[PDB]
Amino acid sequence: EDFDTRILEVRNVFTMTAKEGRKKSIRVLVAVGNGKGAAGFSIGKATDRMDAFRKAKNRAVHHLHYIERYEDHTIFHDISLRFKRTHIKMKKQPKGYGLRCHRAIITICRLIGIKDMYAKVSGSINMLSLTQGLFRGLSRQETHQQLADKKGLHVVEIREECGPLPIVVASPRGPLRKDPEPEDEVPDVKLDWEDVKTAQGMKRSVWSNLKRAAT
RNA sequence: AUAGGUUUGGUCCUAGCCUUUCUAUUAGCUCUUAGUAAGAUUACACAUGCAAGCAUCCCCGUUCCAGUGAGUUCACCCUCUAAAUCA
Ligand SMILES: [K+]
Ligand SMILES: [K+]
Ligand SMILES: [K+]
Ligand SMILES: [K+]
Ligand SMILES: [Mg+2]
């Protein structure tokens, strides 16, 4: 009773049979989630649409991921991934930002319990790949605690709204290293041109930052 | 772009086209009030009226303002140095 189901896609797939010719089947993608991190998805197939809905709904609950939510409202860090030909680039956002993402990601996020996030889907906009990719990235996100333990260092959060106050969000449960992490003068990191282009005010889009209903 | 529709018996990939947003002109139909802003398609031809005077005569001004977008890297910086203002 805690879990809620929401349809993502309904497709009329067809095969050819010797006796009848075109045989119509229903392929249904559904996502189930209780809103507290536990969410899954499944594909249900049946000649009747009701049977397809049921099969997908009941099978999705046996394939539940657990999503680590930072402060139970957003992701811990920005996740960029490619699943097959679909690119999903998700950004961590502050409280009150909303779900500025593809309608399907909005639906899945509400089931997971993420309230604030931005995501841009590029490449193929296949619904199967998007869902499978979204759950792949969110499942693999590293929490602040896991980072502190791996690095043996404090994770200190700097917030602009709190000035210079150092907020320690995670500390290493084991021994704390005494050597500071080597500060590379120039980071050899791969930058997304779309990010850099926006930061330099070089991106004019009439469709970006349009006023939309509360999500 | 938070995207959407569309190739096929069907699936996936790629791809073009189109949809949704925001402005400006024109057309159809329709139209109550007030304030404000803006306002020939045409460097085609133009009836008529007006748009430059001032002032003890000399001078000064009419080389400005206003208009248009035909032509088109004459517009910017540096160097140098006329005219002009500082009786
Ligand atoms: K397309
Ligand atoms: K009209
Ligand atoms: K005079
Ligand atoms: K011109
Ligand atoms: Mg001189």
Q: Secondary-structure element sequence?
A: EEEHEEEEHEHHEEH
State the helical fraction. Answer: 10-25%
Shape: globular
Q: What is the number of strand segments?
A: 10
Q: What hetero molecules are in the model?
A: potassium ion, magnesium ion
Structural class, from helix and strand content?
A: alpha+beta
Please give the alpha-carbon distance between the first and last residues: 24 Å
Going across the biggest sheet, name each strand in turn. 1-2-3-4
Q: Sheet with the most strands?
A: 4 strands, antiparallel
Strand fraction equals 25-35%
Summary tags:
globular, 215 residues, binds potassium ion, four-stranded antiparallel sheet, 10 strands, binds magnesium ion, alpha+beta, 31% strand, four-stranded mixed sheet, 24% helix, RNA-binding, 5 helices, 1 chains
Short description:
With 215 residues, the chain is of the alpha+beta class. The chain has five helices and ten strands; from the N terminus they run E-E-E-H-E-E-E-E-H-E-H-H-E-E-H. The two termini are 24 Å apart.
